[PDB]
Design a binder for this molecule. Structure first.
Ligand SMILES: CCCCCCCCCCCCCCSCC(=O)O
Length: 269
């Protein structure tokens, strides 16, 4: 790894640590039970409702006008995505050539990349039993999410399935930061104006990723192609997620979609 490419990997990593509220080290410290403001455990309806009253009090301050639990949970899912979209938009500036792209191309890349990146990074807050939520202040169990009424019980399980395998690769955030940058730099997204420049930007970050994995994971000679496959798997996970969100939109009148997320989904797949 030349000084320039090692430096670029470090730049990316530092931008990740700055711009994401959650990183894998921070998540592991919490998940280990290692303590001021430890996470509320949400494993059933009683504990969901207690957690809501402390952590999202406005959402349950409406008396009997409060929405159904599953709809409140989905609203909190969406708020989490909106916040992660903001973080990803600032992170993207650290990627060589991204800020030099036409504004419309930056929008297109973020539109198609954000959910892939969201689900990749969600792995860092997931273990086989549950996941961190609410800025690290809740732990919601995988079984509780599976217990929700249909269709809401179908949202998170495929993301756990992705995450258990992704986490078995034992990436750290120096790896994950470059993987997220590579997700954002896909030249095959629909509607790009300057494909060739995006392809060169992609090639550059993927080269940095390949060299970084070779150095940081000398034990796994397949790690780079494994991650290329994970990117394809994410694209599929997102297509399926968008299909479920469309079902919710059509059949669940109380589950209002945030306008930023509606725009991301519009004409996506
Ligand atoms: C009191 C706390 C309740 C916590 C539930 C929070 C679960 C948020 C994590 C991500 C959800 C997945 C986002 C995809 S689902 C919404 C979307 O499509 O953006």
């Amino acid at each position: 790894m030349t000084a320039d490419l090692k430096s670029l990997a470090k730049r990316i990593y530092e931008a990740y640590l700055k711009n994401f509220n959650m990183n894998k080290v921070k998540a592991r410290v919490i998940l280990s039970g290692k303590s001021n403001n430890p996470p509320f455990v949400i494993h059933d309806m009683e504990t969901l409702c207690m957690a809501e009253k402390t952590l999202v009090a406005k959402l349950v301050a409406n008396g009997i006008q409060n929405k159904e639990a599953e709809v409140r949970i989905f609203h909190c899912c969406q708020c989490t995505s909106v916040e992660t979209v903001t973080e990803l938009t600032e992170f993207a500036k650290a990627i060589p050539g991204f800020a030099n792209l036409d504004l419309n191309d930056q929008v297109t890349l973020l539109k198609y990349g954000v959910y892939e990146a969201i689900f990749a990074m969600l792995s860092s807050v997931m273990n086989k039993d549950g996941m961190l939520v609410a800025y690290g202040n809740g732990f919601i169990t995988r079984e509780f999410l599976k217990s929700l009424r249909k269709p809401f019980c179908d949202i998170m399980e495929p993301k756990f399935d992705f995450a258990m395998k992704f986490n078995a690769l034992e990436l750290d955030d120096s790896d994950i930061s470059l993987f997220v940058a590579a997700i954002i730099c896909c030249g095959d997204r629909p509607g790009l104006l300057n494909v060739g420049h995006i392809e060169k930007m992609q090639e550059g970050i993927v080269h940095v990723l390949r060299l970084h994995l070779q150095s940081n994971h000398p034990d796994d000679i397949f790690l780079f192609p494994k991650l290329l496959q994970k990117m394809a798997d994410l694209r599929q996970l997102v297509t399926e997620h968008a299909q479920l969100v469309q079902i919710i939109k059509k059949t669940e009148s109380d589950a209002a979609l945030h306008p930023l997320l509606q725009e991301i989904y519009r004409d996506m797949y």
